[PDB]
Amino acid sequence: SETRTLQKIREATQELLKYGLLEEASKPNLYRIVLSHPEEVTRILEPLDLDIGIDEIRGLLYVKVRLDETPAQDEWAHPLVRRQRLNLEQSLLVAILRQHFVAWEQESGTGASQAQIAIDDLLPQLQIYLGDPGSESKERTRLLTLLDQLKGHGLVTSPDAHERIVIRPIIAHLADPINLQALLAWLREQIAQQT
Amino acid sequence: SETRTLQKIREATQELLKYGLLEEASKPNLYRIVLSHPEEVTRILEPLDLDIGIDEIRGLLYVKVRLDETPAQDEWAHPLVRRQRLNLEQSLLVAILRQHFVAWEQESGTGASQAQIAIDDLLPQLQIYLGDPGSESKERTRLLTLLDQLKGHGLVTSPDAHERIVIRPIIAHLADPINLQALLAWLREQIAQQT
Amino acid sequence: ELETARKQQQSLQPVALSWEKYQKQERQLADWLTLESLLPLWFAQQASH
Amino acid sequence: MEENTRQRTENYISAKNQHPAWILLATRRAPLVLSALKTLFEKSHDGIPLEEAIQSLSSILIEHVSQEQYDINQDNPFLQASRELREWIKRRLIVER
Amino acid sequence: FRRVEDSWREADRALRQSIIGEQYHRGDIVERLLNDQDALLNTPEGRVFDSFQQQLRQSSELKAMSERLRVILSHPSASDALNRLQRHDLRWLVKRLVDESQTVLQARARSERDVRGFMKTGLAAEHHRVGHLLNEFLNLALKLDWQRQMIRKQEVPLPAVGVAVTGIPAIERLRFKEVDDEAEQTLDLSNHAADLTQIGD
Amino acid sequence: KRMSEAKRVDTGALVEAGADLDDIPVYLQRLQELTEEALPEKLNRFLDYLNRSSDDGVTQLLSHIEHEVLVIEERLNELNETMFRVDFQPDRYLRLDTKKVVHESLRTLEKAQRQLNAARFVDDNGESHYKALQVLVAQLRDASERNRT
Amino acid sequence: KRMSEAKRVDTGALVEAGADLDDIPVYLQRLQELTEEALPEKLNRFLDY
DSSP: OOOOOOHHHHHHHHHHHHHSEEETTTOHHHHHHHHHSHHHHHHHHGGGTEEEEEETTTTEEEEEEOOOSSSSSSSOOOTTOOOOBOOHHHHHHHHHHHHHHHHHHHHHOTTSSOEEEEHHHHHHHHHHHHOOOSSHHHHHHHHHHHHHHHHHTTSBOOOOTTSEEEEOGGGGGOSOHHHHHHHHHHHHHHHHHTO | OOOOOOHHHHHHHHHHHHHSEEETTTOHHHHHHHHHSHHHHHHHHGGGTEEEEEETTTTEEEEEEOOSSSOTTOGGGOSSOOSOOOBHHHHHHHHHHHHHHHHHHHHHTTOSSOOEEEHHHHHHHHHHHHOOOSBHHHHHHHHHHHHHHHHHTTSBOOOOTTSEEEBOTTHHHHSOHHHHHHHHHHHHHHHHHHO | OHHHHHHHHHHHHHHHHHHHHHHHHHHHHHHHHHHHHHHHHHHHHHHHO | OHHHHHHHHHHHHHHHHHOHHHHHHHSTTHHHHHHHHHHHHHSOSSOOOHHHHHHHHHHHHHHGGGOTTSOOOOSOHHHHHHHHHHHHHHTTSSOBO | OHHHHHHHHHHHHHHHHHHHOTTOOHHHHHHHHHHHHHHHHHSHHHHHHHHHHHHHHTHHHHHHHHHHHHHHHHSHHHHHHSOHHHHHHHHTHHHHHHHHHHHHHHHHHHHHHHHHHHHTOOOOHHHHHHHHHHHHHHHHHHTSOTTSHHHHTOBOOOOOBSOOOOOOOOGGGOBOOOTTOOOOOOOOOOOOOOOGGGSOO | OHHHHHHHTOOSSSTTSOSSGGGHHHHHHHHHHHHHHTHHHHHHHHHHHHHHHHHHHHHHHHHHHHHHHHHHHHHHHHHHHHHHTSOSBTTBOOOOOOOOOOOHHHHHHHHHHHHHHHHSSSOSTTHHHHHHHHHHHHHHHHHHHSTTO | OHHHHHHHHOSSSSSSSOSSGGGHHHHHHHHHHIIIIIHHHHHHHHHHO
C-alpha cells in the first residue's frame, strides 16, 4: 500500500518512546536524525497526543503530553502515561539532585558540562533529612535502591569507579520544581521542630 | 489550522495501544471507530513497526508486531513491547485454555465471550504435567500465579467471586493453527535434544 | 452418547449399502455406452467384408 | 522360587531409597518427628484443620526446646512449626486436602 | 483400605493421562475405563472393597456388629484392655470404613467426569483441526521434565499478539509527596464516666 | 432419502456437508469412523458398569447418613452422662431419649430402596436396576434442590 | 429433498404419508388445507384469545 517511513526515523522514535528521551552525548545518531527530521517526528507523535520538547543547550530531547491545557479536567489524565507520585524519600532525592544540578549550572553555565556528585556527599544529607537506618551499609543500600529507581525514570546514571554519579539533564524539565522547594522547606522545618 | 486527527480516532488508537487489544463486547464505540478507519490505524502504527490484526467474527482488534523488517530471531525483542516472552508452563496453560475455548465455542458458536471455566476444572489437568505436591492449597497457589501471569498477557480475566475466569477471545489468535504447528515442531526438536 | 452412536451407525450403514449398489450400476453403464460407441465401427468392418 | 531370592533384595533396596516410611525411620531426627506427628493425629480422626495443626505443632515443639542436640528454636516456634509441616508435606508423610 | 485408596487413585490418574493420549478413539477410551475399573476390582484389595460393598447391601449385619461393639466397649474390662483412643477407634470402625470408601467412589466419579468430557465431542470442521493439533502438542508435553524449574521456564517461540504498549516514561508524569497535610488526628483516651439521670422514669 | 434421514439424527458432523453425490465421501467417512470406534457393542457393558458405580454411590451415601445418626446417638449418650453427675432436683436427673421419625419421605425412600434391592436379581441387562436407580436418584436430587422443606 | 424436509418439520399431519411422488397429492392437500382453512382458523382463534 503506502510507502515506508525511513528506518532511522522509526528506530529513533521507538527509542525515544522506550526511554522517554534522547541524549546527544549518548546516542548522537538518533538525536541528530530526529532533530533533522523534526516535522516528521512531531507528525508521527501528534495522533497519540505526544510531542517532543527539545533542548540544544543541554543536548536533551524528551516527550511531552500535547494535550491542550485543561481540556476536559482541571488536571489532565492521559491513557498511555501513568502519573506516578514518588514516595517521600524519592522526592527528597530528586529535590537534592535538582538543587545541586541548578548550582552546577550556576558555576558552569547551563548545559555546558554534565553534573556529577559523590555518594559520600549525598549520604550525609539523607541521614540529615530521614534519620539513621542503623549503619553506613544500610544507608548505602537505601541510596542504591533509590538510585536504581531513578535510573528507571532516566534521572540518574549508574555509580562509577569514583562512587560518583551523573545527574541526567532531564531534571531541568521536571513538572513542578516549586513543589519540590516547598517540600524541602517543610523538611528543613521538620528537622528542626522534631528535635 | 494544523491537521489534527479526529479526536475519536486519536482516543481509540491511544487506548488500543494501551491495552494491546480492544473488544467489541467491552468498548464497542472505539472498536467500531477503528473498524471505520482501519487504514488510518495502519498509517498510525506503521512507523513504530506495529500493525493491526482484525477478527470481526469474534469482535476483537489486536495490535501485532509489523513483520516487514523486524528481526527474524523474535518480535519480542521489539523496543516498545513491555511484557516478557511466554514460557512453556504458561504455554501449557494456554493450550489447555484453548482446548476449553474451542470446546465451548462448538456449542456457543462464535458468540460473545461467555467462555468461562471454573478454577477447579484446571487443577486436575495441570496436575498431570506439573505433578502432585500433595496439597490442594499449594497447587491452587501455583495455578493462580500462572493465571496472573497470563492475565498479564491478556489471555484471561482474573478470578471473579465464584473462582471463575473468562478466556479472552485473543487466545484463538495466540494459539491459531500456524502458531501451534510452529510450537509443536520446536517442542519436538527440544524433546529430540533431551534424548 | 453410546445410544446416539448406535442410531447414527444404523442410519449410515444403508447409505453405504445403496452407494455400492449405485457404483455397480455406474460401472454397468460406462462400459455399456462405450460398447455402444464401438458398435458402429464393428458393423462398418463387417459391412466392408 | 529363585527369583523370590534375588529380586527381593532389589525390592528392599528400592523401598529403602523410595518409600517415605523407611526414609523417615532412617533419618537422624526420626523419633521427634514421629512422636509429634502421633500426638497431632491421635486426638482427632477426621483430619486436622491446617491452622489448628500448626498451632498444636508449635505447642508441641515448644516442649522439645530442651533437647540440646536437635535444632533448638527460642525465637519463633510458630514459624518452625509452619516450616516443618510444609517439609513433611514435601516428604509425602502428610497430605492435605 | 488405606491402600485400596491409593490403588484407585493411581487408576484414575492413569486414565486421565491416557485421555490426553491421542491414539484413543472414543470407543478405546470407554474400553480403557471399563477394563481398568474391572481389573482394579479383581485385585485382592478390589475384592476387599467388593466384600465391603456386599456387606453394605446387607446392612443388617453391619448395624448388628456396631451395636455389639457398643455393648462390648461399655464393659469395665474394656478400659483395662484398651486406652481410650483405641476404644474410640474400635467403636467407630464401621463409620471409618463407610467414610473411607467415599474416596474410592470420588476417584471413580472423577474418571467418569473426564470420560464425559471426552465423549461428547461431535466436533465441527474448524474445531477438529485445532483439536488434533492441541492433542498432539499435549502428547508432546507429557515427555518433558516438569519438576525441573529450568524446563518450566523455557522461552517458547509463540507470536506476540495482544501486544500492549504503556508507560512511555515522559518526565512530566511525575508528581511528589504532598506532606503538607500536617493536621494530626487527635487522640481519645478519656473515660466516659456516665450519669444515669439522663434515662427516663 | 437415506442421506437426509442420516442428517435427521446428526450432531455437528454431517450438517457441515450437503446431501448430493459430492457429499457421499464425508458420509461414508463418518460411517467408517463410527464402525472403527465400535461404540454400540460396548453399550451392554457400560449399562452394567453405570448401574454398579451409581448404586455404590447411592448406597454409600444412604449408609453414611445412618451412621451419622448413630454418632448423634452417641453424643446424646454423652450428654446423659453429664446430667447424671448432677441433681436436677433432690432425687432426680434428666435423661434424653431419642426416637425415629415417621416422615412420609423416609417411607418413600425405604420403598424405593427395597425395590432397588429387588432389582439386582432380575436379569434384563440391568434395565430394571437402571429404572430403580433412576427413581432413587430422582428423590435424592429433588430433596437436594428444594432442601428447606 | 424438499418434501422430506417438510415431513421433518411436520408435527403429525404427514406421519401417515410417505416420501414419494404418489404422496404429492397428500402434500398438495395439506398445503391447500393449511392455507385456506387451518392458518385462517388458527389465526381467528388466536385473535379471539
